[PDB]
Amino acid sequence: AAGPEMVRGQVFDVGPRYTNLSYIGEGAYGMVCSAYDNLNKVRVAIKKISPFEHQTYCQRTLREIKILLRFRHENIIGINDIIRAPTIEQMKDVYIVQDLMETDLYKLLKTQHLSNDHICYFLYQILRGLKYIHSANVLHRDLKPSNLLLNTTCDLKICDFGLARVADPDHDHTGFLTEYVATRWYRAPEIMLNSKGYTKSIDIWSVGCILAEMLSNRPIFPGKHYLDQLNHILGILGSPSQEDLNCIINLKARNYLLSLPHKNKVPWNRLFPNADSKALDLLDKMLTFNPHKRIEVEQALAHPYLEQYYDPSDEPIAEAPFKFDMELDDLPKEKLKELIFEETARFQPG
Ligand SMILES: Cn1cnc2c(NCc3ccccc3)nc(NCCO)nc21
């Protein structure tokens, strides 16, 4: 108490700027708290991060900081500030200050039904942000309701780029049933068949899953485990056609799909009855089995369904593509801590 602040145990400083600390939750190796940007007189959001122990926790922390700091879009959360010790030796944790939000799509969907006007505007915002993210050659890779924060003005902001990668379509193939870290339910089908998740189409499939969940207040493909996820997807889209199967040259995946009993397509309007017809048509294009035929972000924005919002001159793209001077993951826990230290240097006086 005579120095750092304690919130339900554990320390949680902010220096002489953020006050009125109020628990806001947690999640994993990090504690969140609303407070008070005494400078801006607003209650910011502060996440307590301490990854220097786990090497991977350090890389997710770095690219999240790198990406967010270099990005600037109304539909992407930003980093207002970052609190850390003055020395690398003294730095145990790192605090990131971010515009506070009222809730997230996950929590919202848990109790409030969405109106079409609400669904349309949310989708438009998800896609408007994604076009900027993809324009920077970056893939979010973990798009799901819990990563979409909203405030009381219904404004939406994409967050959580801990698993984001710089696109790389040329090095995307891989063998059948290749492990993945991203949230199962919103995982594209090709992930379980022969994709590393290095193409932009991976993000669009996720958004499609979000669209569906917003239409029904329940996850469209809630696969219990890794392979069940694919089984869920196929129960609705039906068996892939000859063409779609041909794109898959990887034999193991192809033979798996072929060993399966044929099943027909489950109609969308039958899955979501009192749901806009134009929306379901966009949902169809998004949840396309073949990654190559899947609609692209800019294409989706120009869909009749989003006509009342579509305005390309008001849908910004990044000043320049993104790249991490490591790409391949592998990088020592120490160095990472050093890189994190310098990446957060701009917020330190002297
Ligand atoms: C960066 N950030 C901005 N607003 C919030 C916020 N706003 C409201 C809030 C409070 C409690 C639960 C969900 C949402 N909650 C969280 N995370 C808490 C873990 O869910 N992070 C935020």
Query: What is the Cα–Cα distance from 48 to 59, expressed in whole angstroms?
Result: 16
Q: Are 269 and 277 in contact (CB under 8 A)?
A: yes
- Is residue 306 domain-shared with residue 209, that is, in the same domain? yes
- Which pair of structure tokens corresponds to residue 313? 């001159």
How far apart CA 23 and CA 178 sit, in angstroms, is: 39
Q: Are residues 106 and 169 in the same domain?
A: yes
Same domain, 207 and 244: yes
- Contacts of residues 258-262 at CB distance under 8 Å and 24 or more positions apart, as own/partner, are 260/234, 262/238
Note whether 125 and 155 are within 8 A (CB).
yes
Residues 58 and 333: beta-carbon distance below 8 Å: yes
Known binding-site residue numbers:
24-32, 47
Query: Do both 148 and 276 map to the same domain?
Result: yes
Residues 342 and 283 in one domain: no
Residue whose tokens read 């994604």? 130
Identify whether the C-beta of residue 99 lies closer than 8 Å to the C-beta of residue 44. yes
- The amino acid present at 71, given as its one-letter code, is F
Say if CB 81 and CB 74 are below 8 A apart: no
Task: Round to whole Å and give the CA distance between 250 and 331.
Answer: 31
- 89/205 same-domain check: no
Q: Which residue bears the tokens 């942000």?
A: 129
Closest CA to 341 of 117, 35, 85, 103: 85
Same domain as 160, residue 11: no
**Cα dihedral angle (275, 278, 282, 285), rounded to 10 degrees?**
100
Are 123 and 180 in a shared domain? Answer: yes
The alpha carbon of 2 and the centre of ligand 1 are apart by a number of angstroms equal to 28
Provide the phi-psi class of 290: left if phi over 0, else alpha when psi is between -120 and 50, else beta. Answer: beta
Same-domain check for residues 73 and 137 = no
The phi, psi pair for 270, rounded to 5°, reads -90, -20
Compute the distance between CA of residue 52 and CA of residue 29 in angstroms, rounded to an integer.
11
Tell me which residue of 290, 280, 183 sits closest to 242, measured CA to CA. 290
CATH code at position 244: 1.10.510.10
Q: Pick from 12, 24, 64, 100 the residue to mutate for probing ligand 1's pocket: most ligand atoms within 8 Å of its CB.
A: 24
177-183 LR contacts (CB < 8 Å, sep 24+): 177/226, 177/227, 177/252, 177/253, 179/226, 182/141, 182/142, 183/142, 183/144
Q: How many CA atoms lie within 13 A of 106 on its CB side?
A: 10
Token digits of residue 307: 């006509």
SS (H, E, C) the chain: CCCCCECCCCECCCCCCECCCEEEECCCCEEEEECCECCCCECCEEEEECCCCCHHHHHHHHHHHHHHHHCCCCCECCCCEEECCCCCCCCCCEEEEECCCCEEHHHHHHHCCCCHHHHHHHHHHHHHHHHHHHHCCEECCCCCHHHEEECCCCCEEECCCCCCEECCHHHCECCCCCCCCCCHHHCCCHHHHCECCCCCHHHHHHHHHHHHHHHHCCCCCCCCCCCHHHHHHHHHHCCCCHHHHHHCCCHHHHHHHHHCCCCCCCCHHHHCCCCCHHHHHHHHHHCCCCCCCCCCHHHHHCCHHHCCCCCHHHCCCCCCCCCCCCCCCCCCHHHHHHHHHHHCHHHCCC
| Structural domains of the chain, count | 2
Q: Are 217 and 284 found together in one domain?
A: yes
What is the resolution in angstroms?
2.2
**Of 13, 37, 81, 142, which one is the catalytic site residue?**
142
Give residue 73 CA to ligand 1 midpoint distance, Å: 19
Alpha-carbon Rg for the chain, nearest whole angstrom, is: 21
Q: 133 and 181 share a domain?
A: yes
Q: Residue 245 pairs with which residues in a beta bridge? A: none
- Of the candidates 332, 331, 324, the one whose C-alpha atom is nearest the C-alpha of residue 65 is 324
What one-letter code names the amino acid at 8?
Answer: R
Q: Parallel, antiparallel, or unpaired: how do β-strands 138-139 and 148-150 relate?
A: unpaired
**Which of 18, 32, 76, 82 has most ligand 1 atoms within 8 Å of its beta carbon, as the pocket-test mutant?**
32
Instruction: Ligand 1: list residues with CB < 6 Å.
Output: 24-25, 27, 32, 45, 77, 98, 100-104, 107, 149
CATH of residue 338's domain is 3.30.200.20
How many angstroms does the Cα of residue 179 sit away from the middle of ligand 1? 29
- Which of 9, 54, 2 lies closest to 28 in space, CA to CA? 54
Of 254, 71, 266, 76, nearest in space to 157 by CA? 76
Is residue 25 within 8 Å of 35, Cβ to Cβ?
no
φ, ψ dihedrals at 106, nearest 5°: -60, -60
**Ligand 1 atom closest to Cα of residue 102:** 8
53, two tokens: 């122990």
Same domain, 57 and 196: no
List, in sequence order, every residue forming a beta bridge with 294; answer none if it has no partner: none
What the block records as the tokens of 162 is 């801990």
- How far is the C-alpha of 123 from the C-alpha of 292, rounded, in Å? 22
CA distances from 274 to 96, 116, 270, 277, 306 (A): 42, 10, 9, 9, 18
Its domain, for residue 277, covers: 101-329
Which residue from 316, 318, 45 is spatially nearest to 167, judged by alpha carbons?
318
55: CA distance to ligand 1 center in Å? 25
281 catalytic residue (yes or no)? no
Tokens of 116: 């079409």
